[PDB]
Amino acid sequence: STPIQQLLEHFLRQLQRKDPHGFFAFPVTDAIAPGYSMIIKHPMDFGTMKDKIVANEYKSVTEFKADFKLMCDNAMTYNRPDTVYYKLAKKILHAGFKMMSKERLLALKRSMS
Ligand SMILES: COc1ccc(Br)cc1-c1nc(N)nc2[nH]cnc12
Ligand SMILES: [Br-]
């Protein structure tokens, strides 16, 4: 794997630690979540992201972070705010936005000098 793949794997591992029950580990099915495919146009989950890293499909942290954002946004769209899934998505979203912030990335870049 390349350094960018390893960095994204790092971020993904840290984010998945925030989902110990594995609700974001694989695609949400309509059996699990009635009507989901009628509401959510562009599904995403951590497993799909892992596959995209392995398939070398992300060129940048920006592209990875967009998939991560989509995953949380989907959960916060389908599910109401009082639900397990909405609250967990929000928790993960905030963790990821901090982890992959411009300031965090600048700190990493400084150390790569
Ligand atoms: C794969 O998802 C699940 C797995 C097991 C169980 Br029980 C629930 C979900 C799930 N349910 C809903 N309503 N919204 C989600 N957003 C992300 N996960 C989910
Ligand atoms: Br719930």
Side-chain angles (χ1 to χ4, degrees):
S1 70
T2 59
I4 186 69
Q5 290 171 295
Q6 296 173 41
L7 183 58
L8 300 185
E9 289 181 322
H10 169 75
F11 290 154
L12 188 58
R13 282 191 302 270
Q14 301 299 117
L15 294 164
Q16 282 212 83
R17 296 203 333 187
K18 308 285 186 146
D19 181 32
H21 299 132
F23 293 123
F24 290 85
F26 62 101
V28 182
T29 66
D30 289 0
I32 289 164
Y36 194 87
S37 64
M38 301 194 309
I39 303 303
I40 299 302
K41 193 183 191 194
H42 299 305
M44 189 46 61
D45 64 278
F46 283 137
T48 298
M49 296 172 65
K50 175 64 169 211
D51 294 341
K52 292 178 70 167
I53 295 169
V54 170
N56 214 24
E57 286 183 43
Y58 296 119
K59 297 199 285 287
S60 66
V61 170
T62 288
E63 290 181 356
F64 176 89
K65 189 175 183 190
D67 271 351
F68 163 75
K69 184 185 178 183
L70 169 61
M71 182 189 69
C72 296
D73 278 347
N74 288 343
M76 293 170 74
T77 294
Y78 176 81
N79 296 288
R80 307 228 109 104
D82 70 336
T83 68
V84 167
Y85 317 106
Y86 179 106
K87 292 171 195 271
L88 180 58
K90 187 187 262 193
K91 187 182 173 68
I92 292 165
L93 179 68
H94 286 190
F97 272 55
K98 182 171 172 62
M99 187 174 66
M100 300 178 278
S101 70
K102 295 286 178 186
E103 202 58 34
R104 195 214 169 155
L105 293 172
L106 177 59
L108 282 40
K109 292 179 191 185
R110 288 187 193 115
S111 71
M112 297 161 176
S113 311

